[PDB]
Write a protein that binds this ligand. Structure first.
Ligand SMILES: [Co+2]
Ligand SMILES: [Fe+2]
Ligand SMILES: [Fe+2]
Lengths: 289, 285
């Protein structure tokens, strides 16, 4: 509309340009990154998880909310489509490599599903700096250590709560209490992807539809390997791990990684050796590399 | 000039905390009894006697051959794993120090041996392993603590650690003189504790004879920060023989950064890692 909008880019768009949008606007959308069949396969895998009856024991997040809370943690362990296809998408990683150039290696801190039902209110505007509170004190100019990647799995509309993003707001000193009309809407089709810079002020739009159609989203956080993964994928069976590509294994914390100089050795190692060597980890695309 | 303060092992933790914010460092006298120091040294002797490896060594291959180093001592030295790592005074200090940031764990603990004729290190801050630390404001909650265990005598001759008191308040390292620093001269069993941002240097070893100076360095970091050393390949039997505190230090349990993190970190299936693993411990039901 009137205000400058989120730019929607083709999957083959220029990475330098995407990197610049992140620094100027703080966010952008990749159009039709995931084909519809991938999206639907992912959705069915998620349906299976959500249909599982509630467990007997403790659930750290879920126990904090009423029983109608819809959440699937660490989707990489239970959704093969995410693990084998979405997680290792080459466009996503081209962006990450450029974005994290100053900080070095990155990996997956978390990827999880939320569903926002009809009649739910919008989120307060905020920054994604709560999981690793030290991020709250990092200056704007410092090398970024986190990137938010948002996957709509149903339509995002003005009505059902499309993500509200305030362009340029990563340059603000604080969040404050911004008006809703300061934000623009990440309206999207399933298969699109929203990419959001560290420190950008934003809010989930809730869902004001009344027809019972929930809005589904998978949120993935790619962080500097300096930062401890929220979700640990260390209990994945070896057969599952070795079925992944090297990149996948790197994302899920199964390999030694490298923060930027002046760390000149790396991180996540043991016996002064690479973790994957100590584990004698095979990978699906080891013959080609 | 002001020297490093030497405190009895049973001194009041509030005083220790005060010293870290004012001086940036202090020494605990006789924290580890002689038998602990001796068994630990014997265990390290075993590792040091093990022949040089064939394959790549990530850290060691970057330095000259006189580099003497034993990585992740917790996996090979029961005395560190069962006694030193879980010392209650160290953790009283950590709990006070990390109050603002939340839970902490072990990023690394390793041995270095410094031979005769080695020069002192350049003055520096310990902000290289996790470079994001370089950009954290002075006022922000600390996310790292250096704990230094002399395993041989630290003398003015053999390279006692050089610490510049109050330098954590400096904007940058600059080009400090050696006489700006004071020496952490210590006996085995003592412990040197050094705050984030404190400018310091290993003292090398100016002796011309005798056995090298032996030191174990442990870095305790906010659980927000990825451990340099990962202890995830430890055998289950070894892990379960440890106390809950030990398991928490070595990354085998779910941990909790301060609010506004209200769930925790290092979890899976929306459960605690130790519950998913059905982890036993020496001191849990
Ligand atoms: Co002078
Ligand atoms: Fe958010
Ligand atoms: Fe140092």
């Amino acid at each position: 509309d009137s205000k400058p909008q989120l730019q929607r880019l083709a999957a083959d768009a220029d990475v330098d340009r995407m990197c610049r949008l992140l620094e100027e606007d703080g966010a952008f959308i990749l159009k039709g990154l995931l084909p519809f069949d991938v999206v639907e396969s992912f959705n069915r895998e998620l349906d299976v998880q959500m249909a599982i009856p509630p467990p007997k024991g403790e659930r750290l997040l879920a126990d904090k909310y009423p029983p109608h809370f819809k959440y699937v943690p660490n989707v990489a362990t239970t959704c093969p489509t995410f693990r084998n296809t979405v997680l290792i998408n080459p466009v996503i990683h081209a962006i990450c490599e450029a974005y994290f150039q100053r900080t070095g290696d990155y990996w997956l801190s978390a990827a999880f599903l939320r569903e926002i039902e009809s009649g739910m209110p919008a989120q307060p505007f905020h920054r994604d700096d709560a999981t690793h509170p030290l991020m709250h004190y990092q200056p704007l100019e410092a090398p970024p250590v986190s990137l938010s990647v948002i996957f709509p799995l149903t339509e995002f509309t003005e009505e059902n709560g499309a993500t509200e993003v305030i362009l340029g707001s990563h340059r603000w000193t604080e969040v404050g209490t911004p008006e809703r009309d300061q934000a623009v809407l990440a309206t999207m089709d399933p298969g699109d992807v929203l990419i959001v810079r560290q420190r950008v002020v934003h809010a989930g739009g809730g869902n004001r539809t009344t027809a019972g159609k929930p809005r589904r989203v998978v949120l993935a956080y790619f962080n500097s390997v300096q930062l401890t993964p929220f979700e640990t994928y260390r209990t994945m069976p070896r057969e599952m791990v070795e079925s992944m590509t090297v990149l996948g294994q790197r994302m899920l914390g199964w390999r030694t990684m490298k923060p930027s100089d002046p760390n000149i050795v790396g991180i996540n190692l043991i016996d002064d050796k690479r973790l994957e060597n100590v584990l004698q980890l095979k990978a699906a695309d080891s013959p080609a590399l």
